[PDB]
Design a protein around this nucleic acid. Structure first.
Ligand SMILES: [Mg+2]
Ligand SMILES: [Zn+2]
Ligand SMILES: [Zn+2]
Ligand SMILES: [Zn+2]
Lengths: 144, 97, 44, 263, 51, 66, 45, 48, 49
RNA sequence: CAAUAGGAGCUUAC
């Protein structure tokens, strides 16, 4: 969980004072202390009744309301983004709709990406939960 | 936010009036805040993880208040012990010796 | 017979860790629980 | 007045003594060879199918760090000064890598020799990944198991080491002068005696040690510089040295041009 | 045999299904051989009991 | 994970030497002598090869999911 | 429709949003989507 | 610092910090200053 | 909520040292400099800017 | 043109 860096102890330029520390940009460029980051988002469908359930689906503007301010143009027809796609902040990675109880009768419950993070989708998993409703896990990847 | 705007700059805990002082802005890349090294003593700060807060005055009265009462040059001498609180530190002292 | 050196001590310690590992207290507690504690709680 | 005395000269490294030049000149030459001599390196990677255990940007970083033959890179243009859209044939070199493991035992290693040059501004001798010998296997890139595949289209471009270390033609430029401290430019830390506790420079026998009767000289400047350039095979040592000199010359000519054409 | 409930299992214990299965089948079951166990899995989340 | 192409500190290419280093280690030669023959003379380059841990062997053991 | 893959038996297939989530060859319970078809660029830095 | 603050005002005293910092930092950059394991070692007679 | 409260127009990040800044200068990241703002009344001395 | 609450736990700098 570390790397053997070559360290000098010197008052070189004054940028390492009070527990600061100068690092070689070239060594960073060659891969020193470089790390991968994986974030996984989760979501599933709930059952609010008999025939009232949620659905993974790309929410069209006409039948849906209160759509997030991110872009939906990355979801496939199943409401899921595909692995291998570049994703920015505020982008939707799991589209989901919750029906409106008693056209234009649906609200969205989509999961956007965190407003700070960039990265690349790595592994979009799809299964069913304890109660047999559809279950999705999406692992993102990035490099820091 | 632009160069030379007065902003109130602050580290917790704010034990005395010189823990929160008004600084002039200089815009830079590389997402950390930059401080001249002689003001790290009144803040009791160092550069091993610390974070500090920045408050932007939203009117001219508060700009003038910051620049004429809270500015860093005005707090060099403290009333706590009628002596300076900012000095030469930590490599400039060794080098000047 | 000769004097036990530091390396002999590290050989002994390697034997200790080969047997027990680093989380043996958790595992042994839970094995004791499932072997005896549940039945004893049912028969309390 | 400047003089060069080569002490060792092979393809990858040259060891030479530089003399009758100012220290600023020698240090500027060292810096130029480390940072501003253009080379060729993969600057854009395109993944088609990567089912290996390694991640995409991991492999991209490794491919960018692969030395490529750059002998003719100076007759080439920077991709920011070409009228062309998405890479053309004259300001970029396109490489292909295709690898695949078939079978259910063993591991197939993917080496840099497997990179294949497809296009490039012929007949310029640029682009090929550098091999040490005829039988060299190159750099390790990835490893593959059953049914795992790697399909990559790399683009190579011209750049310098200021932007990123992968364009550096040099590894380490050893550099020293005045082995006997006649100029007193250093001041030796010691416990008992500074002469016993400090190892001799490898060029100590190249200069006369100071005599005990000698007094300090305040006219002497540094005049002889011993430096050992090493390369990564992308350029040859004489090529690195000569193009560092030429790059410095053209930087000074640029300054002169701006000065004269500022009147 | 009345079913009275489900007890969570400590991984790598005598009642875990990974206790057997020497390294090859551990690899086939997607389990890291360095993983030492000692924790529980509740709703897919690893939980450790602090003494 | 896998042997780095360059030395972090100076930039010498060490990515083509890991297999040779392992072959040198099989016939009994100790690490310093193997690093000497591969002509790694600076201790930065030497610690590049001497401290590498090859984890790709462990990562490759989990069956490809495609 | 869109290509999926088993997690246990590595079978490739494609489901069309109305059959349940299952593998043909084995019948396993967990599936992963397939990699996209678009082309992805990296900076090699 | 106290003298310059009292005689010249806060602005000149503030600029004094910068002047001294810059001069001394340049000199130390081209002089150098380090510390090593040998700086904590006393000779044999002092150890006795 | 009365003796102390959360306020708009504030920022926070790690601090670093800079020997080349003046005593009353603070270096502000570009992203924060663009996220935070100051309202400047338009007048006949600053309209071009 | 609209992004819940309450708790517990682990941490950061003094
Ligand atoms: Mg601190
Ligand atoms: Zn072009
Ligand atoms: Zn090295
Ligand atoms: Zn299957």
């Amino acid at each position: 969980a570390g790397q053997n860096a070559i360290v000098a102890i010197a008052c070189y330029s004054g940028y390492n004072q009070e527990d600061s520390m100068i690092m070689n940009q070239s060594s960073i460029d060659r891969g020193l202390f470089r790390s991968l980051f994986f974030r996984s988002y989760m979501d599933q469908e709930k059952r609010f009744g008999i025939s009232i359930v949620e659905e993974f689906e790309k929410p069209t503007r006409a039948t849906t309301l209160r759509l997030k301010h991110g872009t939906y143009e990355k979801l496939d027809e199943d409401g899921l983004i595909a692995p291998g796609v570049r994703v920015s902040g505020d982008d939707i990675i799991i589209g989901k709709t919750t029906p409106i109880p008693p056209y234009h009768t649906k609200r969205d419950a989509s999961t956007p990406l965190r407003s700070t993070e960039n990265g690349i989708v790595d592994q979009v998993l799809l299964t069913t939960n304890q109660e047999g409703l559809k279950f999705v896990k999406v692992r993102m990847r990035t490099t820091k | 936010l632009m160069d030379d705007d007065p902003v109130l700059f602050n580290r917790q805990p704010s034990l005395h009036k010189m823990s929160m002082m008004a600084h002039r802005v200089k815009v830079m890349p590389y997402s950390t805040f930059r401080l001249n090294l002689s003001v790290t003593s009144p803040y009791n700060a160092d550069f091993d993880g610390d974070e500090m807060n920045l408050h932007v005055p939203q009117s001219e009265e508060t700009r003038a208040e910051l620049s004429q009462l809270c500015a860093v040059p005005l707090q060099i001498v403290s009333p706590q012990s009628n002596k300076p609180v900012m000095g030469i530190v930590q490599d400039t002292l060794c080098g000047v010796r | 017979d000769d004097t036990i050196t530091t390396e002999d001590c590290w050989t002994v310690i390697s034997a200790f860790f080969e047997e027990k590992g680093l989380v043996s207290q958790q595992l042994d507690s839970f094995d004791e629980f499932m072997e005896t504690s549940i039945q004893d709680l049912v028969w309390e | 007045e400047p003089k060069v005395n080569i002490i060792n000269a092979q393809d990858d490294e040259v060891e030479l003594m530089l003399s009758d030049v100012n220290l600023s000149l020698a240090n500027s030459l060292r810096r130029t060879m480390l940072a501003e001599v253009p080379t060729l390196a993969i600057d854009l990677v395109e993944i088609k199918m990567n089912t290996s255990v390694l991640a995409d940007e991991f492999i991209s970083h490794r491919l960018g760090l692969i030395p490529l033959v750059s002998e003719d890179v100076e007759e080439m243009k920077y991709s920011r000064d070409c009228t062309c859209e998405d890479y053309c044939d004259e300001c970029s070199v396109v490489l292909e890598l295709s690898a695949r493991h078939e079978g259910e035992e063993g591991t197939t290693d993917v080496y840099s020799s497997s990179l294949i040059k497809v296009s490039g501004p012929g007949n310029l001798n640029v682009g090929e990944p550098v091999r040490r010998d005829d039988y060299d296997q190159g750099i390790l890139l990835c490893k593959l198991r059953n049914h795992q595949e790697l399909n990559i289209r790399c683009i190579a471009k011209k750049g310098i080491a200021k932007e990123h270390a992968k364009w550096s033609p040099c590894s380490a430029i050893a550099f020293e002068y005045d082995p006997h401290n006649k100029l007193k430019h250093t001041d030796f830390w010691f416990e008992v005696d500074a002469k016993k506790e400090w190892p001799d420079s490898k060029y100590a026998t190249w200069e006369e040690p100071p005599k005990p009767g000698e007094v300090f000289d305040y006219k002497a400047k540094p005049n002889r510089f011993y430096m050992t350039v090493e390369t990564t095979g992308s350029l040859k040592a004489n090529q690195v040295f000569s193009r560092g000199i030429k790059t410095l010359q053209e930087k000074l000519a640029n300054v002169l041009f701006e000065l004269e054409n500022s009147r | 045999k009345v079913h009275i409930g489900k007890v969570p299992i400590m991984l790598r214990s005598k009642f875990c299904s990974l206790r057997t299965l020497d390294e090859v089948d551990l690899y086939k079951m997607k389990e890291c051989p360095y993983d030492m166990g000692g924790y529980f899995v509740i709703n897919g989340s690893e939980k450790v009991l602090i003494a | 994970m896998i042997i780095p192409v360059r030395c972090f500190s100076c930039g010498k290419v060490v990515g083509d030497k890991w297999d040779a280093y392992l072959r040198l280690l099989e016939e009994g030669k100790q690490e310093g002598d193997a690093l000497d023959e591969l002509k790694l003379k600076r201790y930065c380059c030497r610690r590049m090869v001497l401290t590498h841990v090859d984890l790709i062997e462990k990562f490759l053991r989990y069956n490809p999911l495609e | 429709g869109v290509k999926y893959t088993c997690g246990a038996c590595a079978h490739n297939f494609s489901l069309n949003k109305s059959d349940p989530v299952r593998c043909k060859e084995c019948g396993h319970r967990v599936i992963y989507k397939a990699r996209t078809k678009r082309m992805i660029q990296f900076d090699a830095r | 610092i106290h003298t310059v603050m009292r005689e010249k005002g806060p602005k000149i005293c503030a600029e004094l910090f910068g002047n001294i910092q810059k001069v001394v930092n340049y000199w130390l950059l081209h002089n150098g200053f380090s510390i090593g394991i040998g700086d904590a070692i006393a000779d044999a007679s002092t150890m006795k | 909520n009365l003796m102390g409260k959360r306020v708009d127009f504030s920022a926070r990040t790690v601090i670093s040292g800079d020997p080349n800044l003046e005593l009353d200068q603070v270096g502000v990241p570009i992203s924060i400099a663009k996220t935070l703002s100051y309202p400047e009344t338009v007048t006949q001395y600053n309209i071009h800017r």
